Amino acid sequence: RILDISGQPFDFDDEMQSRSDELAMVMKRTQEHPSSGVTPNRAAQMLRDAERGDLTAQADLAFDMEEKDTHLFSELSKRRLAIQALEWRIAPARDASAQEKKDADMLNEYLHDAAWFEDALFDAGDAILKGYSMQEIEWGWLGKMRVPVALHHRDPALFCANPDNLNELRLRDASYHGLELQPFGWFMHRAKSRTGYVGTNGLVRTLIWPFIFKNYSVRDFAEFLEIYGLPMRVGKYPTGSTNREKATLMQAVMDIGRRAGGIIPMGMTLDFQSAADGQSDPFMAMIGWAEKAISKAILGGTDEVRREIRNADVGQLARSINRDLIYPLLALNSDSTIDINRLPGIVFDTSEAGDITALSDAIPKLAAG
């Protein structure tokens, strides 16, 4: 039996938990769009439900926001590209033995040789907006070595938090208690932007309101622009007019454009009344305020703060990788028990690039000693 990281023995099954016939029904889902006609009460209810462990409506709302809002998508893409551009290397523990160094370098070489690692990291970046990111693991054989063939992303809406114990995710199976996650078969990465339980640490909680304000303002602005700068044309006719005479007047009113002429009787009158007036200053002011609020929420400014954000979420991702992927590989490949405090980890190249021009000052120091 394979020994867990916590020290509790268990049985390892290569088949996915989602491949079960009974679970096949819940796998197929229709992606509802709760962003149509958003109401502050509706958003508050969705957030309240997500607090208790629903996590479905909030996930769909976050998906809708990440595609409907251009600024939010741009900022998220910028952040994910910034985190993805870093370089990583596997290093063993301090004062490591020769065998430990050999294992560390072989794992490092394998992970650079693994194509699915980049996709796995990119998919794990989804926990910046959503509260969590869940990916399957497809175990396989490569030269008598247990390695993952590929990792499959899963919809965040298919997971619910345990009411008895929060901060623990479970697979939804239409039951009071969801199915426990299959050990050595999942890659769960969560980003704790704010302290608290899972499902409340995502960026959706703070970004729901500016999105609503900005979208409503822009749609109202577009509607106002539609009926702007074209006054309505009206025509007054005497009470004794024939039914046919009204039709001719109605057709004549509809035929006004460019440099138009026309003759009207003394009894009839024609006037122009504007159906909309105002300026675009308030709509644009609100849109700009919402956009800068979103930019402040995501990036921290409208740089050093970007570097700190990258360091923090890179460290969180490294901890998640060490907890989820590094240990099972060694545990399955090695027959003996894996030491808990002597396992290799992943270190990202989080170092500021030096300036070769200003490091010429080291020569006098080297001469002095």
Next chain:
Amino acid sequence: RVPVALHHRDPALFCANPDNLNELRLRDASYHGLELQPFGWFMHRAKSRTGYVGTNGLVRTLIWPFIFKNYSV
């Protein structure tokens, strides 16, 4: 054995498998499309946003500003 030439194809002639998303198939007026012929296609997809295929393109976010700009102009 080398490829003589590669011919681009209309993206509208492909449909995703309802049983298993993220997999493209050639449309043939059937519930399940024809599976792609091995060693006969060059399929490149850009994952701008995570999720299933057909939702990771730039159309999803660029549809609205295009509408607003064109109607305004």
